[PDB]
């Protein structure tokens, strides 16, 4: 299934190992100003930047528009777009072409297809992403028309946990780092991946809030019993090759507590706490929605590991060169971007909701 | 949206105040011996799983099916079916309804819909679970034809955990406790929630694994990038009332691990561990599939909750009577239901996966 | 697939031989009022609803809402309902049900799924046509509220077609005829039909129209290239069995037409010729939708056929009995409730075209 | 909605005017050789019938397969193609900028997205068109794995019928005639039509076949209730701009039949006749499926026109250069692969009938 979205559809051309990835993103209302900018600041996050960086301009991936698109608006048609790789010499990366990396999709890819086909270059996971960063975009700016915003950051890595978080930071962090009072133990760990020719995994915190201070965000977004909230961010997150699991609010942590302690009080404000993380009942209940997504350590280490090539005969994988020592934290962007284009979609599917809406927009508007 | 599933597709008749409560189960192929035994003997399992009970075909179950089925046998068209209950005179537990229980989706469902409704029975929530046991067990006998099975069992409950698993002992114990020798442990927490008229949480462990000879599961179920089959396991499960977070293998441990210690080694005889619990790259790798599902503590409290009604005005939730001391219990039945039904519709997914599967049988028909 | 719609989704119980049929309509707004006179009345038309009659209370089908209405009015849950039917015991109309009666789906079926089931009493038809206008009553009352309904009548039976077109003589007319100067031929067509134990092929004609006088219907329905209205009121009409061609306004006679004699203009509202039908570019142009369904003469006949049996043998299939003589009578209502089911699904997916539309909604409540 | 197909899904980059269109089919079973040869040919068909007699032109659109394949066989993942068209610097054959011409969806685009889009060029069909051929290319060769193949050819041009059909003699003919016999008066109707400007209607006859001399194609193809093969059939086909009406087997002329004279009786091995046009109660029934699809005369004609601007003010139409004269001939071209990937869709949706796929897929092997 190379779509994602119920009416706000992203399409995907796919694994690919040529110059050219496209996608095409589908449901978006008409007369949304095109924020070139925002696109474009999004592509350079995705590559994680850190210390020190060029204009991604000619340096990266440049998003092309083919369609949907008229005079800097959405024409309520698809947003047809194609995205261009690397094209002068390259380095290394890579083993024997024939055998089952551990941790990755081989395996998988070869026996529910059969044909092989492995070659490096961020492999799949990489150029999807970007795929999804860049429909994300987009998504940002039809939620932006309505007061919302997406954000993300590192809240752990290799165990080191924030405190505090704060996400103005993390933008400017090399690890997207929320807690600046651990960010220094968690960039060592890092460090100490990499020396070590190792990988570790990493923790992100997602969230989705009001851009006018403190307002609620729309209450009821969610579908039906099996089109929740929270159900389609877990299948969007859990989805991101690396995730290993999800939690909405206070997660795991809610199954150690009592009723009393765990239950969200009200009053005619709003809700005096929010473990629920925004979703009560799979449905949007106008607090911030609170999703941690937990990564396991990047696959490729540049240490020999037992396994088998595809005769069945045991042989060493050895990936020569270096690895991202942690996914998660480019990670945490494109997870912002899913629940993005999660919440988009349900913004969309919410309009059918009551009557009224009918009413106003046919014998009305 | 009222439907679970691509093809295998599973839809409800929905939220009801009535007696009767129906779904249709739509995409099983035909030719299944219907295992009435099953589909009996799963109502049972979703009550619970108390030493002392009354001899079926009374009280509440008894599935009445409508459609799909002719002399025992799945006919290819939909298997629809329905559920009844009540009958004369109850008990009572019911003091003004027109407030927002915390903790409930009361709330969400008013302002999405603007409609009160949530009347006694707790609302609903079994009544779903009723309809999901009830088609998983359909889907269970699918599974069963190519020799996969769907087990569960709670391995905590207000924070005491279970060491060790033993699932044939889950199936007769009053918790569905996986280790007896911490079962009295977790009895005595679900005990002492009832003396404080409180409620406490659990996880439910979910696994999947094969019968067959080679004692492997199919390798490559999960269907491109966009329906990964951990992705949909996520979707569901967290999807299920009660749910705030869900895991897969190693899950949240994962996060904590460094590359060489996470990642899954193999040899001649196949993987050394199973971290990935199962799911790799978004498909089966042929290992046991491994969940990890978090429920929060009960909703429903004999306790004094501050609140707003449905206008805006804040007063006092007071829930007289007995309520589940712990959900989780009862949900790891339906996770496991949920399991086979999302395992079945990938089964039947993959059949398209390479020409070879087409030509055998069309051709070599 | 069992299910009908985008948005709006009809889902079936499907084909069944037990006492109870059941279906379920999702997506329908909240707040809606139940016009159980119009649900009941639809319930009368689809049974012939010839002259001479008795209370169809202990005399036909009664609609019971399960779930999805609450002081009668929609909830915005799903709205499920039963029909229950049959009465006495039948005879024979058929010795060895072995085999495959001619123009039935006996033959497909059975390579299809390979179960020999066939039960009589209308088979396939008949049941699944009162889920349809079931269903297509509560799509009915959704398009009242923005003021558009929809109708049919008989132009054509036997080939004695109708020159002047009057639904409200159609309405209580015992064969829905529009033109009283051609009911009676067309009448003496059916009964000779009867007399020689054959049957009769018809036309059906369909419109959608907006309730206030001369008044357009909304211009802009239909989504995408592959979700067009026209492409989707086709689906619908040829999927009623015994349809065999579907016509949009000038239809067939538009191949035989000359630009110059055909090509559709404007002014400032909606074009005057209704040679479109009412859909423009795949789109609602404003214009009253006209829509023509041929009708095959029915299956069944009490004559000698020759066809085969479960094994292959030749065989002389010979049903006793009395038969439908024209379907398209009955099937005249069943393909204005599709239509009504279709447009209202377009009404709904097109309140996502505008990102006005989201504002006044999101940011102006 | 950009997506066409349940399994096998064709996703397009929709209505664009740059120098480049994309589309991506996803579903294609891997272990698929790709057959160059065919697109290419296919892609030719596509331009042949205007401006192309006798040795039609190649000078134009070339295919880019950018994922999915591999050493020329399918992976199995997502195959993503882009179109690259184009030629020459604009001049003249081109009027106002600023209005919907006379029967062009131009009018209903801005009512339902309200956007001063357009620039013309074909509109978009002709773009769409491009993708469709090329997406059917990938159908046809699956459809091959099994004997399947797709022809189609025209039946009638202005009136002008055929009365004997020759597919193998439409490919070389330069309007695709299936009768040499009333070819020269069809044309001359073409010519009499671009000589004054002006246009005509047509229709387009197209089948499936087993491709062994004498056999039947697959039983039971089409699913359930709402997917039924010809309703899915009418929905591609109808959904091509121009398309009126749709016809399967004996179409319109079946209303005018009696049942001893339509239904189909059976033989020691098949049908005596195929009114029925290849499906039966929603399936094929094996023998040749039959479709005729009626298009309009095209609305645009070098001839004078009229009808509205954007703002329902005052323009003109006198459209320069000349225009298609029959928009039938290359849309027959367009059905044939329509039906390619719609048959194909259904030959693997059926894949899932019955039980014994499942264990012949999973248990031998």
Same mark, same amino acid.
């Given at each position: 299934?190379?779509?994602?979205?119920?009416?706000?559809?992203?399409?995907?051309?796919?694994?690919?190992?040529? *110059?050219?990835?496209?996608?095409?993103?589908?449901?978006?209302?008409?007369?949304?100003?095109?924020?070139?900018?925002?696109? @474009?600041?999004?592509?350079?996050?995705?590559?994680?930047?850190?210390?020190?960086?060029?204009?991604? +301009?000619?340096?990266?991936?440049?998003?092309?528009?083919?369609?949907?698109?008229? #005079?800097?608006?959405?024409?309520?048609?698809? %947003?047809?777009?194609?995205?261009?790789?690397? +094209?002068?010499?390259?380095?290394?990366?890579?083993?024997?072409? !024939?055998?089952?990396?551990?941790?990755?999709?081989?395996?998988?890819?070869?026996?529910?297809?059969?044909?092989?086909?492995?070659?490096?270059?961020?492999? /799949?996971?990489?150029?999807?992403?970007?795929?999804?960063?860049?429909?994300?975009?987009?998504?940002?700016?039809?939620?932006?028309?309505?007061?919302?915003?997406?954000?993300?950051?590192? %809240?752990?890595?290799?165990? %080191?946990?924030?405190?505090?978080? *704060?996400? !103005?930071?993390?933008?400017?962090?090399?690890?997207?780092?929320?807690?600046?009072?651990?960010?220094?133990?968690?960039?060592?760990?890092?460090?100490?991946?990499?020396?070590?020719?190792?990988?570790?995994?990493?923790?992100?915190?997602?969230?989705?809030?009001?851009?006018?201070? !403190?307002?609620?965000?729309?209450?009821?977004?969610?579908?039906?019993?099996?089109?929740? $909230?929270?159900?389609?961010?877990? #299948?969007?997150?859990?989805?991101?090759?690396?995730?290993?699991?999800?939690?909405?609010?206070?997660?795991? #942590?809610?199954?150690?507590?009592?009723?009393?302690?765990?239950?969200?009080?009200?009053?005619?404000?709003?809700?005096?706490?929010? +473990?629920?993380?925004?979703?009560?009942?799979?449905? /949007?209940?106008?607090?911030?929605?609170?999703?941690?997504?937990?990564?396991?350590?990047?696959?490729?280490?540049?240490?020999?590991?037992?396994?088998? *090539?595809?005769?069945?005969?045991?042989?060493?994988?050895?990936?020569?060169?270096?690895?991202?020592?942690?996914?998660?934290?480019?990670?945490?962007?494109?997870?912002?971007?899913? $629940?993005?284009?999660?919440?988009?979609?349900?913004? $969309?599917? !919410?309009?059918?909701?009551?009557? @009224?809406?009918?009413?106003?927009?046919?014998?009305?508007?």
């Amino acid at each position: 299934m190379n779509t994602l979205g119920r009416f706000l559809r992203l399409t995907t051309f796919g694994e690919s190992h040529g *110059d050219v990835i496209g996608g095409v993103l589908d449901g978006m209302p008409s007369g949304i100003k095109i924020d070139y900018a925002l696109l @474009e600041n999004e592509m350079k996050r995705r590559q994680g930047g850190r210390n020190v960086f060029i204009t991604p +301009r000619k340096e990266d991936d440049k998003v092309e528009i083919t369609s949907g698109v008229f #005079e800097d608006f959405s024409t309520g048609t698809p %947003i047809g777009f194609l995205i261009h790789n690397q +094209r002068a010499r390259s380095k290394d990366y890579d083993n024997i072409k !024939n055998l089952f990396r551990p941790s990755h999709a081989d395996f998988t890819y070869f026996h529910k297809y059969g044909i092989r086909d492995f070659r490096g270059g961020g492999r /799949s996971s990489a150029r999807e992403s970007a795929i999804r960063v860049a429909a994300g975009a987009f998504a940002k700016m039809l939620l932006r028309e309505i007061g919302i915003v997406c954000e993300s950051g590192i %809240i752990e890595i290799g165990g %080191i946990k924030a405190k505090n978080y *704060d996400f !103005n930071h993390a933008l400017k962090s090399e690890i997207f780092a929320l807690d600046e009072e651990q960010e220094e133990a968690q960039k060592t760990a890092i460090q100490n991946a990499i020396k070590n020719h190792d990988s570790i995994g990493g923790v992100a915190l997602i969230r989705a809030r009001s851009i006018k201070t !403190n307002q609620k965000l729309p209450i009821g977004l969610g579908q039906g019993l099996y089109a929740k $909230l929270d159900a389609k961010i877990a #299948e969007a997150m859990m989805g991101l090759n690396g995730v290993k699991a999800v939690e909405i609010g206070k997660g795991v #942590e809610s199954s150690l507590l009592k009723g009393s302690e765990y239950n969200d009080l009200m009053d005619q404000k709003g809700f005096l706490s929010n +473990r629920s993380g925004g979703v009560l009942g799979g449905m /949007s209940n106008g607090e911030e929605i609170i999703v941690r997504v937990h990564f396991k350590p990047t696959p490729s280490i540049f240490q020999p590991q037992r396994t088998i *090539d595809i005769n069945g005969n045991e042989c060493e994988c050895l990936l020569k060169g270096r690895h991202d020592p942690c996914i998660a934290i480019r990670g945490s962007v494109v997870c912002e971007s899913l $629940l993005a284009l999660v919440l988009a979609d349900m913004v $969309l599917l !919410n309009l059918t909701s009551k009557i @009224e809406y009918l009413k106003t927009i046919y014998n009305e508007n």
